[PDB]
Scaffold this motif. Sequence first.
Motif, PDB file in Angstrom:
ATOM      1  N   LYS B  14     -73.781  55.562  40.030  1.00 41.40           N
ATOM      2  CA  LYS B  14     -74.725  56.684  40.146  1.00 41.40           C
ATOM      3  C   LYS B  14     -75.677  56.364  41.287  1.00 41.40           C
ATOM      4  O   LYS B  14     -76.303  55.294  41.349  1.00 41.40           O
ATOM      5  N   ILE B  15     -75.740  57.311  42.199  1.00 48.26           N
ATOM      6  CA  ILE B  15     -76.598  57.133  43.379  1.00 48.26           C
ATOM      7  C   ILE B  15     -77.157  58.505  43.665  1.00 48.26           C
ATOM      8  O   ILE B  15     -76.426  59.502  43.612  1.00 48.26           O
ATOM      9  N   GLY B  16     -78.455  58.624  43.922  1.00 50.17           N
ATOM     10  CA  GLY B  16     -78.999  59.952  44.243  1.00 50.17           C
ATOM     11  C   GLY B  16     -78.848  60.894  43.061  1.00 50.17           C
ATOM     12  O   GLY B  16     -78.764  62.103  43.291  1.00 50.17           O
ATOM     13  N   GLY B  17     -78.793  60.391  41.826  1.00 52.05           N
ATOM     14  CA  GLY B  17     -78.654  61.198  40.619  1.00 52.05           C
ATOM     15  C   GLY B  17     -77.245  61.738  40.377  1.00 52.05           C
ATOM     16  O   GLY B  17     -77.007  62.465  39.386  1.00 52.05           O
ATOM     17  N   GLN B  18     -76.311  61.336  41.261  1.00 51.36           N
ATOM     18  CA  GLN B  18     -74.962  61.833  41.239  1.00 51.36           C
ATOM     19  C   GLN B  18     -73.989  60.748  40.820  1.00 51.36           C
ATOM     20  O   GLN B  18     -74.090  59.612  41.284  1.00 51.36           O
ATOM     21  N   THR B  31     -71.313  47.252  50.820  1.00 49.03           N
ATOM     22  CA  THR B  31     -71.006  48.475  50.063  1.00 49.03           C
ATOM     23  C   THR B  31     -70.948  49.651  51.015  1.00 49.03           C
ATOM     24  O   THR B  31     -71.909  49.825  51.803  1.00 49.03           O
ATOM     25  N   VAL B  32     -69.883  50.443  50.977  1.00 49.54           N
ATOM     26  CA  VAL B  32     -69.687  51.539  51.895  1.00 49.54           C
ATOM     27  C   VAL B  32     -69.333  52.773  51.081  1.00 49.54           C
ATOM     28  O   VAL B  32     -68.387  52.732  50.288  1.00 49.54           O
ATOM     29  N   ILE B  33     -70.065  53.852  51.280  1.00 52.20           N
ATOM     30  CA  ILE B  33     -69.921  55.093  50.545  1.00 52.20           C
ATOM     31  C   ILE B  33     -69.600  56.236  51.492  1.00 52.20           C
ATOM     32  O   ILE B  33     -70.083  56.242  52.645  1.00 52.20           O
ATOM     33  N   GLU B  34     -68.838  57.197  51.012  1.00 51.45           N
ATOM     34  CA  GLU B  34     -68.561  58.416  51.752  1.00 51.45           C
ATOM     35  C   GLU B  34     -69.839  59.180  52.054  1.00 51.45           C
ATOM     36  O   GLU B  34     -70.871  59.012  51.424  1.00 51.45           O
ATOM     37  N   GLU B  35     -69.784  60.027  53.040  1.00 51.85           N
ATOM     38  CA  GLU B  35     -70.918  60.795  53.500  1.00 51.85           C
ATOM     39  C   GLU B  35     -71.676  61.477  52.364  1.00 51.85           C
ATOM     40  O   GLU B  35     -71.067  62.146  51.512  1.00 51.85           O
ATOM     41  N   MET B  36     -72.966  61.252  52.380  1.00 52.12           N
ATOM     42  CA  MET B  36     -73.899  61.800  51.407  1.00 52.12           C
ATOM     43  C   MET B  36     -75.285  61.652  52.024  1.00 52.12           C
ATOM     44  O   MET B  36     -75.451  60.966  53.028  1.00 52.12           O
ATOM     45  N   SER B  37     -76.225  62.321  51.375  1.00 51.69           N
ATOM     46  CA  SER B  37     -77.613  62.231  51.823  1.00 51.69           C
ATOM     47  C   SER B  37     -78.333  61.159  51.013  1.00 51.69           C
ATOM     48  O   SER B  37     -78.257  61.096  49.805  1.00 51.69           O
ATOM     49  N   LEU B  38     -79.039  60.318  51.730  1.00 56.41           N
ATOM     50  CA  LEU B  38     -79.892  59.286  51.190  1.00 56.41           C
ATOM     51  C   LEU B  38     -81.276  59.370  51.853  1.00 56.41           C
ATOM     52  O   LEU B  38     -81.408  59.798  53.001  1.00 56.41           O
ATOM     53  N   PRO B  39     -82.267  58.912  51.095  1.00 59.48           N
ATOM     54  CA  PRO B  39     -83.610  58.951  51.635  1.00 59.48           C
ATOM     55  C   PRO B  39     -83.930  57.812  52.599  1.00 59.48           C
ATOM     56  O   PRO B  39     -83.288  56.780  52.550  1.00 59.48           O
ATOM     57  N   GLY B  40     -84.962  58.063  53.412  1.00 60.28           N
ATOM     58  CA  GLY B  40     -85.501  57.074  54.299  1.00 60.28           C
ATOM     59  C   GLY B  40     -84.837  57.014  55.657  1.00 60.28           C
ATOM     60  O   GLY B  40     -84.025  57.862  56.068  1.00 60.28           O
ATOM     61  N   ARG B  41     -85.179  55.961  56.372  1.00 59.99           N
ATOM     62  CA  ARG B  41     -84.608  55.709  57.680  1.00 59.99           C
ATOM     63  C   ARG B  41     -83.317  54.929  57.540  1.00 59.99           C
ATOM     64  O   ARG B  41     -83.119  54.185  56.576  1.00 59.99           O
ATOM     65  N   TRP B  42     -82.457  55.091  58.533  1.00 60.21           N
ATOM     66  CA  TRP B  42     -81.261  54.275  58.633  1.00 60.21           C
ATOM     67  C   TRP B  42     -81.225  53.537  59.966  1.00 60.21           C
ATOM     68  O   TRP B  42     -81.907  53.881  60.924  1.00 60.21           O
ATOM     69  N   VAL B  56     -71.273  53.173  60.887  1.00 52.93           N
ATOM     70  CA  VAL B  56     -71.840  53.618  59.640  1.00 52.93           C
ATOM     71  C   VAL B  56     -73.367  53.673  59.771  1.00 52.93           C
ATOM     72  O   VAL B  56     -73.931  53.103  60.726  1.00 52.93           O
ATOM     73  N   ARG B  57     -73.989  54.336  58.808  1.00 50.40           N
ATOM     74  CA  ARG B  57     -75.427  54.376  58.711  1.00 50.40           C
ATOM     75  C   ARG B  57     -75.862  53.398  57.627  1.00 50.40           C
ATOM     76  O   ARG B  57     -75.422  53.534  56.498  1.00 50.40           O
ATOM     77  N   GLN B  58     -76.738  52.458  57.956  1.00 48.53           N
ATOM     78  CA  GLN B  58     -77.216  51.492  56.982  1.00 48.53           C
ATOM     79  C   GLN B  58     -78.545  51.906  56.407  1.00 48.53           C
ATOM     80  O   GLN B  58     -79.547  52.002  57.166  1.00 48.53           O
ATOM     81  N   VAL B  77     -73.194  54.177  54.823  1.00 51.50           N
ATOM     82  CA  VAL B  77     -72.631  55.520  54.645  1.00 51.50           C
ATOM     83  C   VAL B  77     -71.795  55.854  55.865  1.00 51.50           C
ATOM     84  O   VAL B  77     -72.273  55.777  56.997  1.00 51.50           O
ATOM     85  N   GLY B  78     -70.543  56.252  55.617  1.00 52.21           N
ATOM     86  CA  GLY B  78     -69.682  56.575  56.748  1.00 52.21           C
ATOM     87  C   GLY B  78     -68.285  56.961  56.315  1.00 52.21           C
ATOM     88  O   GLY B  78     -68.079  57.111  55.115  1.00 52.21           O
TER      89      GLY B  78
END
Lengths: 99, 99
Positions: B14-18, B31-42, B56-58, B77-78
Amino acid sequence: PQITLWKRPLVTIKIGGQLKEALLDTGADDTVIEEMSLPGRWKPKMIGGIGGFIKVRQYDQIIIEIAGHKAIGTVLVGPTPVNIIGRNLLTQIGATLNF
Amino acid sequence: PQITLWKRPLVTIKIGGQLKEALLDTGADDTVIEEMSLPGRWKPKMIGGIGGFIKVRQYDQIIIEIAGHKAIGTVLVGPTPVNIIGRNLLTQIGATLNF
Ligand SMILES: COc1ccc(S(=O)(=O)N(CC(C)C)C[C@@H](O)[C@H](Cc2ccccc2)NC(=O)O[C@H]2CCC[C@H]3O[C@@H]4OCC[C@@H]4[C@@H]23)cc1
Ligand SMILES: [Cl-]
Ligand SMILES: [Cl-]
Ligand code: NA
């Protein structure tokens, strides 16, 4: 043994009469070794991961020794950046993930 | 739990409530996750897998639950083919390899 995951879980294997270092990789369905000769028949295969696909040679019924434990199974040979012991052989040495 | 490797070691995260499915992957440093929205800077990162490198975006210090265990750490994320839980978070949930 119990291997922690602070570092890469690298072990010594013996394959085709050769010692190599390989990664115990629960995210790999199959075992993939850098280019080497193996005896017997083979057939081509494409496998994919991050960055896309590579072409490998699939050899069946190959005996490996993994950290001292013998197994038999399919080994894929091709331009992998690291030697990977995948689930097809991890299961044969009784490896489990525990937490 | 004790997870054998006859099947892919897929768990719910569960990440981002999902809720999402992900692979427990001892062959992955990160850890590498498919495209999604996360908070903050990368920050940028290049990672190399079997087929070559991808960008990827860290995102650091992201709250993520893995198989019911709470972790807080770096998520990349990527364009990964599957969501992968790597050793950076496997260590947080206390996972080991055993044989
Ligand atoms: C059909 O059977 C197989 C099909 C695919 C593969 S795989 O090698 O592509 N892979 C499958 C995953 C991606 C679903 C197994 C992984 O464990 C792979 C194994 C791996 C390890 C090293 C090089 C290539 C592949 N790790 C990997 O790609 O890690 C990269 C993403 C995370 C950050 C980095 O950590 C790793 O350590 C540093 C670089 C990599 C890089 C193996 C067997
Ligand atoms: Cl096999
Ligand atoms: Cl078993
Ligand atoms: Na054979």
